[PDB]
Design a protein around this ligand. Structure first.
Ligand SMILES: *C(=O)[C@@H]([C@@H]1N=C(C(=O)O)[C@@H](S[C@@H]2CN[C@H](C(=O)N(C)C)C2)[C@@H]1C)[C@@H](C)O
Ligand SMILES: *C(=O)[C@@H]([C@@H]1N=C(C(=O)O)[C@@H](S[C@@H]2CN[C@H](C(=O)N(C)C)C2)[C@@H]1C)[C@@H](C)O
Ligand SMILES: [Cl-]
Lengths: 243, 242
């Protein structure tokens, strides 16, 4: 079977009074696994997971020259302390620094942004709303399975931007690495529009396979943000993908 | 299990449109689509919701049978065929919204919600009152979820009576000749972008059934005949119909 539903994962959500979906894709076997086929295909605002396409576009157009170029803090004090400082592409993705990315989006502009998202086959391809906030409160919507589709293209250097742009963004996605696995991923937290959700999308590299993943979960308060990674890792552990 | 056939894209291109056709071969348990991503994107069902609405109305006795007359309220609407009395068959044929809104009000939010959950029909998070949610964007469903729903209806597997299912399948009858029968329902969603047309149903042959669900961009009503015409071009290419 190409898609298997595994309701046993639901226990990882219920143990925290949570609801959500984990989608896994076994690249070598070309098979998918999820606790909820319907929610796997439900499309939501990408929030900070949009930094993946945003970064690729910015690099390919030369808005970002490389991963060292520094984006000076604009001096406005924001509620997230790590945003109140200078950043490069690596640290901007690590601390999800929206204001840096909003500047990239303004410099890309609506025509190039729209064209590029069409070329990437990204979600519903709709950038309606403010050019610099549409991924937080505009028309764009992507599901977990569509996040996987997009990430598999990035993994294989098959998106319609240069190989270099793809390699730099994969470098910026680096989240965790040890002797057992590498995780390249990006978190999101959508709060402007209901329903409020957390995301974690990315992949696990093993010695001889890659497992892509995309999860989202209801997120009524920020109390639960750690569960985005913790529930995903419980699933990976259950499936014997990681120790 | 699923096969992407981009050659069908040419049937949309001939017409300067974009869309998706999903087919399912019941005997072989295999699916075909020109567009896997669009096949799984959820769109407002519009008039295709009359299929579940009918099943629920019959099953709860809101509709006694397919002969019961629902009188016109005397208010002239934009669609001429709505300005007259209807029964279930004609209300389905002419997609008579005001008749189906009254069914929904009599079903009521609680029963509608529970029954659509039981059918596994549409998004988990439905919003909007019972007479409007299915017009205004409070529910959405993909082409592949339409197929799964219609497969259960075909086999009398939904959690309503066999009688309710047989009556709705009768009301869905669209075309029959010596080569095939088509049971289906059209949709035209205009209140939220992208405006789309649907056609969902199945083709009965002597020894197999092919389920189908298509939707396609519909920026004006001029293209509405393409819902059936494009589907049938795909059926004809696939040797399902002569
Ligand atoms: C992206 O979806 C949104 C951002 N993502 C966040 C999140 O995951 O909480 C925050 S920023 C993040 C909070 N902790 C990090 C930090 O500073 N340290 C770990 C030291 C940064 C934000 C809501 C974005 C659209 O706002
Ligand atoms: C359903 O999606 C919506 C209805 N569907 C329509 C359609 O397919 O055009 C119209 S009613 C339809 C128009 N032509 C038929 C007719 O009167 N004759 C064939 C003579 C009836 C409508 C937008 C519904 C949600 O409104
Ligand atoms: Cl790296």
């Amino acid at each position: 079977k190409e898609w298997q539903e595994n309701k046993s994962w639901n226990a990882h959500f219920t143990e925290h009074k949570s609801q959500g979906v984990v989608v896994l894709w076994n690249e070598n076997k070309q098979q998918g696994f999820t606790n909820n086929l319907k929610r796997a295909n439900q499309a939501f605002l990408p929030a900070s997971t949009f930094k993946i396409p945003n970064s690729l576009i910015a690099l390919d157009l030369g808005v970002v020259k490389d991963e060292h170029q520094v984006f000076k803090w604009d001096g406005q004090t924001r509620d997230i302390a790590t945003w109140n400082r200078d950043h490069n592409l690596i640290t901007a993705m690590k601390y999800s620094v929206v204001p840096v990315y909003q500047e990239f989006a303004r410099q890309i502009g609506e025509a190039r942004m729209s064209k590029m998202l069409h070329a990437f086959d990204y979600g519903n391809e709709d950038i309606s709303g403010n050019v610099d906030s549409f991924w937080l409160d505009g028309g764009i919507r992507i599901s977990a399975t569509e996040q996987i589709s997009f990430l598999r293209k990035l993994y294989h250097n098959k998106l319609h931007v240069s190989e270099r742009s793809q390699r730099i963004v994969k470098q910026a996605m680096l989240t965790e690495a040890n002797g057992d696995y590498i995780i390249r991923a990006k978190t999101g937290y959508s709060t402007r529009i209901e329903p409020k959700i957390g995301w974690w999308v990315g992949w696990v590299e093993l010695d001889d396979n890659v497992w892509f993943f995309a999860m989202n979960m209801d997120m009524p308060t920020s109390d639960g943000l750690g569960l985005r990674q913790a529930i995903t890792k419980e699933v990976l552990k259950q499936e014997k993908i990681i120790p």
